[PDB]
Amino acid sequence: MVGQIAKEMGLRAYIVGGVVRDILLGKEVWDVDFVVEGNAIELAKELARRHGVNVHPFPEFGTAHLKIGKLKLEFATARRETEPASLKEDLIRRDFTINAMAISVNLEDYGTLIDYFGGLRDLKDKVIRVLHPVSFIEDPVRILRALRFAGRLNFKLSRSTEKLLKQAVNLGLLKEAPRGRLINEIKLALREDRFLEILELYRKYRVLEEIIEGFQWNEKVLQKLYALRKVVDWHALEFSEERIDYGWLYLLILISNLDYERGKHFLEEMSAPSWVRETYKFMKFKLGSLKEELKKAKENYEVYRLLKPLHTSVLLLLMLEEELKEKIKLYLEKLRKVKLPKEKIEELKKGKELGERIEELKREIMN
RNA sequence: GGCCAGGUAGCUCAGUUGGUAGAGCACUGGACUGAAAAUCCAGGUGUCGGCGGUUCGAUUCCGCCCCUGGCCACC
Ligand SMILES: Nc1ncnc2c1ncn2[C@@H]1O[C@H](COP(=O)(O)OP(=O)(O)OP(=O)(O)O)[C@@H](O)[C@H]1O
């Protein structure tokens, strides 16, 4: 219906950005980005009016958001910078060639992909390429983004883009960039399943040394990251109903050798979940003594008492130890699974004493 | 859209090793009165947001959502 309304208004609307990319990548998303030559606001208002849904106008930005079913629509007016601006001018201000393309929703040319910079070729060649040599200088945040994309889509930076990126990092532009955009970029990064590869790209171009103060790469942390990769794989395989956010674990591994001050400050900036802060504060101190207690574990009930109160994240961190691995697993798929019939429990009940008694019965069953 | 608080009576507010809930003023009833108020005895002051899951047992552990306020990402 968008092409129809745009036809009535004598306008030109287009699907633009990553939304296009994901379409060519086959991935279907509920968020669609529109670029409109002429006023996008009235188009969005009319579209929202015909479908009988609410509209969220932003005149100063010149963009309007409206939701139809599960679809989230954003209409934006064509702009040359972040006289009427052409579509080409609006696409050339973007980051990479794969994100620079567009698909016309206008009824006449409908279905046509509009690509000026050859982003289709780069998409087919798996290449992350900047539009202009000053790209990373303009927006240093992109330095992360590229890597992130190269992590997700398993693409490669072009020689141009790579040299330009390395130059951009060498100038320390990553420090000049707004802290918030960078932190948000990392937050976007850790949510990826291929995020480990993104971390490899972060190590290669050494951006984390720039962003995080006092951070340096070593081998033990890397091996811990691959071990955590395996553990995450297994846990998300068998226990997949129990899944949590895995990226935060990797983030904790990265900052493990860092000072508690810088760690707490960084996790503060990252707006990390509560369980992440708890798992970190537990990892920095009590984790060692906990492991030492797990080494002294003989009966299964002691293992129970030492494990069950802990979160899943702590357990996954405990699986990093080779000796503790099979123990943790045994606690997972076996130890904590058990129950009791009616009459028996009825005899058990005859306050806290019921709990202590139940514990005595459990340690009676285990050992 | 991300996160942090806040969610406890009608209103304004505390509560951690899971184990049988609280304050200040409104609420009912009776003693008291010509009526009413005060006051006394008392006692409702409540599925401690909603829905599932783990647990013998969840305000608490977790997951998904509702509401309100604040930090922002608001390309
Ligand atoms: N820093 C930037 N510089 C230039 N263009 C950008 C920048 N950030 C975003 N864009 C453009 O705006 C669009 C915003 O899309 P969005 O913010 O959802 O990110 P994305 O590329 O879609 O990845 P994701 O879906 O993971 O967020 C992108 O398609 C990109 O082309």
What SS3 string covers A226-246?
HHHHHHHHHHHHHCHHHCCCC
CB count within 10 Å of CB A284 equals 17
- Among residues A119, A117, A103, A118, the alpha carbon closest in space to that of A12 is found at A103
Residue A183 to residue A124: CA distance in whole angstroms: 31
Q: Same domain for A272 and A324?
A: yes
Residue A87 to residue A244: CA distance in whole angstroms: 41
Q: What does the DSSP 8-state code read for residue A113?
A: E
- In the block, which residue shows the tokens 């086959």? A26
Resolution in Å, one decimal place: 3.4
Q: Collapsing DSSP states into helix, strand and coil, what is residue A68?
A: strand
Residue A70 CB lies within 7 Å of the nucleic strand B:
no
Q: Residues A59, A40: contact at Cβ < 8 Å?
A: no
Q: Same domain for A154 and A58?
A: no
Residue of minimum CA distance from atom 15 in ligand 1: A18
CATH number for the domain including A131? 1.10.3090.10
Experimental technique for the deposited model: X-ray
How many domains does the structure of chain A reveal?
2
Q: Same domain for A20 and A162?
A: no
A134 is in an annotated binding site: no
Residue A45 CB lies within 7 Å of the nucleic strand B:
no
Residue A90 to residue A105: CA distance in whole angstroms: 17
Residue of minimum CA distance from atom 20 in ligand 1: A18
Residue A65 to residue A178: CA distance in whole angstroms: 26
Residue A92 CB lies within 7 Å of the nucleic strand B:
no
For every residue of A155-223, DSSP letters joined together read: -EE-HHHHHHHHHHHHTTHHHHS-HHHHHHHHHHHHT-SSHHHHHHHHHHTTHHHHHSTT----HHHHH
- In the block, which residue shows the tokens 């802990």? A310
User: What residue numbers bound the domain in which A324 lies?
Assistant: 125-367
Residue A50 to residue A29: CA distance in whole angstroms: 23
Q: Residues A207, A143: contact at Cβ < 8 Å?
A: yes
Residue A81 to residue A228: CA distance in whole angstroms: 43
Q: Same domain for A145 and A238?
A: yes
Q: Same domain for A79 and A222?
A: no
Residue type (1 letter), A306: L
Q: Same domain for A7 and A100?
A: yes
Residue A74 to residue A66: CA distance in whole angstroms: 7
For residue A90 and ligand 1, the question of a CB distance below 6 A is answered with no
Residue A151 to residue A205: CA distance in whole angstroms: 13
Q: Same domain for A155 and A260?
A: yes
Residue A221 to residue A213: CA distance in whole angstroms: 17
Q: Residues A361, A348: contact at Cβ < 8 Å?
A: yes
- Among residues A281, A269, A331, the alpha carbon closest in space to that of A302 is found at A331
Neighbouring residues of A216: CB distance < 8 A, sequence distance ≥ 6: A209
Q: Same domain for A113 and A137?
A: no
Crossing angle of the two packed helices A247-254 and A195-204, in degrees rounded to 10: 30
Residue A159 to residue A306: CA distance in whole angstroms: 53
Q: Same domain for A8 and A54?
A: yes
For residue A148 and ligand 1, the question of a CB distance below 6 A is answered with no
Phi, psi for A66 (deg, rounded to 5): -145, 145
Compute, in degrees rounded to 10, the torsion defined by CA atoms A262, A265, A269, A273: 110
Count H helices and E strands in chain A, helices first.
Answer: 22, 9
Q: Which of A74, A91, A124 is the last residue of a domain?
A: A124
